[PDB]
Design a protein around this ligand. Structure first.
Ligand code: NAP
Length: 180
């Protein structure tokens, strides 16, 4: 079950399931990690279970999420994710405040303000996804390791942030199992 370690909260697949299954609105934020693990299909399945529970689901895509422009968009289309449920940062970033949960799967730098300080990086000076504005922020990643930018993400310490350590595909599959 869930336990606190260091300055962060480490939740479990069941915690994630319980929280999202009982939320009214969830915003999914995919990143590099989802591509490494090819978790898009499991992710779309999870969204299906949630929508079946009456939960409102949508996806927020950062301009440089992943490792090529439009990387997340093609992976989501691949998983048969409804095109209308996918939004670019500029048109969904203001919606995080009205969201109960921000499901960040395999993303880091695109939610980190400290990531766009390097002029040699693709994300330099770009806006960031305000996942904090949501009731709860769930991060799926294998550890507390940094992203491409190589900088710490302080969101991992916020009060409304729960870390779900594990492979993006494996963890998402466990969440799906715990849900139905
Ligand atoms: N999109 C482009 O065109 C492009 C091109 C070149 C560079 N970039 C740069 O790449 C970055 C993109 O950011 P982002 O949030 O998408 O990615 P990111 O910050 O580079 O990384 C996201 C996270 O995925 C986790 N991860 C890795 N393998 C995983 C797995 N198998 N399962 C679950 N999690 C896994 C990582 O941590 P763990 O080790 O903890 O799992 C990592 O912190 C930005 O800094 C951007 O500027 C973008």
């Amino acid at each position: 079950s869930g336990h606190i370690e260091g300055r962060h909260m480490a939740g479990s697949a069941e915690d994630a399931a319980f929280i999202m299954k009982n939320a009214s609105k969830v915003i999914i934020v995919p990143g590099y990690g989802m591509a490494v693990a090819q978790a898009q299909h499991a992710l779309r399945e999870m969204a299906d279970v949630l929508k079946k529970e009456g939960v409102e689901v949508s996806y927020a895509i950062h301009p440089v999420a992943g490792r090529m422009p439009g990387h997340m968009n093609v992976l989501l289309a691949e998983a048969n994710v409804p095109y209308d449920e996918v939004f670019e940062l500029e048109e969904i970033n203001s919606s995080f405040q009205t969201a109960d949960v921000a499901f960040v799967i395999g993303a880091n730098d695109v939610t980190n303000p400290a990531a766009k300080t390097d002029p040699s990086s693709p994300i330099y000076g770009m806006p960031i996804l305000d996942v904090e504005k949501a009731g709860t922020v769930l991060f799926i990643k294998r550890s507390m390791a940094s992203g491409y930018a190589g900088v710490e993400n302080e969101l991992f310490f916020r009060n409304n942030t729960m870390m779900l350590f594990g492979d993006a595909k494996k963890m998402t599959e466990q969440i799906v199992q715990a849900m139905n």
